[PDB]
Amino acid sequence: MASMERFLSVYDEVQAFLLDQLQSKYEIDPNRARYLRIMMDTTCLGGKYFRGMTVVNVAEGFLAVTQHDEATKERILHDACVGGWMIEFLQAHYLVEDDIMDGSVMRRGKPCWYRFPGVTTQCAINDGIILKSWTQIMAWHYFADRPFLKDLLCLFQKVDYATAVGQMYDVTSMCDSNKLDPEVAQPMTTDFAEFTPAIYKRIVKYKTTFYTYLLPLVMGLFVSEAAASVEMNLVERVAHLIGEYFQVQDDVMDCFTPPEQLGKVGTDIEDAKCSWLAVTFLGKANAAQVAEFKANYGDKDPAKVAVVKRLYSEANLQADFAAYEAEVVREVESLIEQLKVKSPTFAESVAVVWEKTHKRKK
Amino acid sequence: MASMERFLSVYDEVQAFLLDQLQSKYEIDPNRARYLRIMMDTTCLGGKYFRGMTVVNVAEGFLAVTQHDEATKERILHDACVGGWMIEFLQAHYLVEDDIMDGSVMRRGKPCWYRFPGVTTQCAINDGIILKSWTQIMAWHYFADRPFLKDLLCLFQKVDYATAVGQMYDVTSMCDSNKLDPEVAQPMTTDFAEFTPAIYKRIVKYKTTFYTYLLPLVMGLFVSEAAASVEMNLVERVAHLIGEYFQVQDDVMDCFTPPEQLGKVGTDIEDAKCSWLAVTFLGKANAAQVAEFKANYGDKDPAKVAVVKRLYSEANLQADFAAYEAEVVREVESLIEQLKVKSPTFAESVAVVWEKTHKRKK
């Protein structure tokens, strides 16, 4: 796709800027420049670019309807690409650190970054820090003189914090809340009392929705100077709804989509995660199913994991998923109808966003 | 000390703000609030508060000589405390992640954060991310309306990036540059060709000087609206000089100061670090000393580490350290004399900063 290739051409610019600046201001040597170029490529490319391409689509929408000089159109488009890369680099940071946290093996069809033989956990941790740092370098360099600079930095910062809090909800979702204690080694829950749709919703709201949907949508609005032309409460409702759905699919694919197709190897069962599948299963199983789940969940043993997967297949969670999906379509369409009132162009971008999400197979 | 106790009283405010906001906007539950309060306390308290108390001292200096209403004096002092905590939280972030990277056992006289039984590497990584996030929450909340806000955020961001780059220089200092390669597992250097004072200086300049000295000094200037009243080139020279000296002491103590006194257990020998001791040693040893160093450095075996420590004692590095110290005193005094030209009060703060650094035994 041509537009994708163009968003990609701005990656090339941003990379050249970052690496040149390392040479000229940070005393980097050539082989460390090469290392960081490879690290940027592996952690920032290969994904679907949904978050990045959402910023661009939001801005393209407003450009079709807004009068500007050509030079202004070019500036806005370039701004939207740079903001999109800020979010892809933030994603790259999150993915580096999450793969370590989750004990993951594959990412975008390659070894996780920390599994590269020449990298290891020790360096990946810091490479993840550098990725985040680059988002700010990029923002201050490109947007220094833009009116939306303070708004963008302030939003970016809140969104990052929400995600970090969400990650803490996730990484501790298999422990009992009353037992959390830095001094005491953490046993896994035996009762699964906290595997509920409300608790699940809390995980997912913070860890994914803000950075995957709120952030790109609003950044599209910032670089378009169009924020005031939308109902923000609606922007937040729609971001959190499509965001949750997006995470539910991720959870389902972790279990049932082949690594060949997904580009990653699942760990949610093994990691004892509060996934949608585990929650929806406890939502419907009988006493004996519950017990066999309890004896097998959250263990790396392939035979225990297979037992969990059979239980999932037997419980017909495909039926629950259809019904959940049908409900989201209802609410997202409602939200999109409500957005046209003030912002038809934005509502349309949100439609496109939803369509792309709804259809994804990875 | 009373002033310390007062800087400390602003920690209490900042903590209450952060935890209340987690409850009211982030849907946190009480036991996770407790966990993060304990995490903030363990990772942010117990240090010497040098960086934090430098912001306060810089501002107190300008207040003694500048006319203000009392209300303004109180605002400036409070601003200096908050900026100081932003840097202590940044330090706490760096320390959490560094202890993981370095395989360290003790920090401020307690187990490293990731060694707490109830924490582990998996959670500490994210706790370190939250610490950094909190610096921005704190900045945007407290300084939203201040004229120095953009300057402070932009400086903070550049300083953080420099430190992250510096950390990459450190963590790869025991490998040959020409051999760095994400695809290939990294062998330790055999020739130690890159253990040179120039390369050492590069490590230390980036990993420590910006965040430990440039940042607090300039933040004191920002919250004092006094930046324009100094020669910034001199501020940078003095920060980088005292900063390097500060790191040299850290390196010496890692080897020779008892854990009981230091509050940490050294790993530089075991980690094959490019420390000042390793560099100054190669700076003077004879052929046979060089060989015995090479056969023992960068191995966790207590007998190999002891061999390295004997070689250090025999080479009389205490003599090199005295001579290095004497030279820094010369240059720092020169820089302080040069600061009085435009900024006597600032020169004095820098004198106090130097005196505290020069005298430290931990």
Ligand SMILES: CC/C=C/c1ccc[n+](CC(P(=O)(O)O)P(=O)(O)O)c1
């Ligand atoms: C590091 C802060 C946030 C990370 C973050 C937030 C949201 C999602 N993810 C990563 C996914 P996956 O590993 O790609 O399947 P998850 O592990 O959640 O299933 C990672």
Ligand SMILES: CC/C=C/c1ccc[n+](CC(P(=O)(O)O)P(=O)(O)O)c1
């Ligand atoms: C994580 C980014 C920077 C970390 C950073 C920078 C500078 C210094 N440190 C930490 C010290 P130590 O572990 O306290 O002795 P080092 O390990 O360098 O001897 C840590």
Ligand SMILES: C=C(C)CCOP(=O)(O)OP(=O)(O)O
């Ligand atoms: C589920 C989440 C939030 C992490 C993976 O996100 P994506 O599936 O969008 O990953 P890439 O396209 O960037 O690979």
Ligand SMILES: C=C(C)CCOP(=O)(O)OP(=O)(O)O
């Ligand atoms: C050497 C460096 C830069 C890390 C430790 O810094 P400090 O020795 O200042 O640690 P605390 O006082 O914060 O414990």
Ligand SMILES: [Mg+2]
């Ligand atoms: Mg994961």
Ligand SMILES: [Mg+2]
């Ligand atoms: Mg995860």
Ligand SMILES: [Mg+2]
């Ligand atoms: Mg997943």
Ligand SMILES: [Mg+2]
């Ligand atoms: Mg260390």
Ligand SMILES: [Mg+2]
């Ligand atoms: Mg270190």
Ligand SMILES: [Mg+2]
């Ligand atoms: Mg040290």
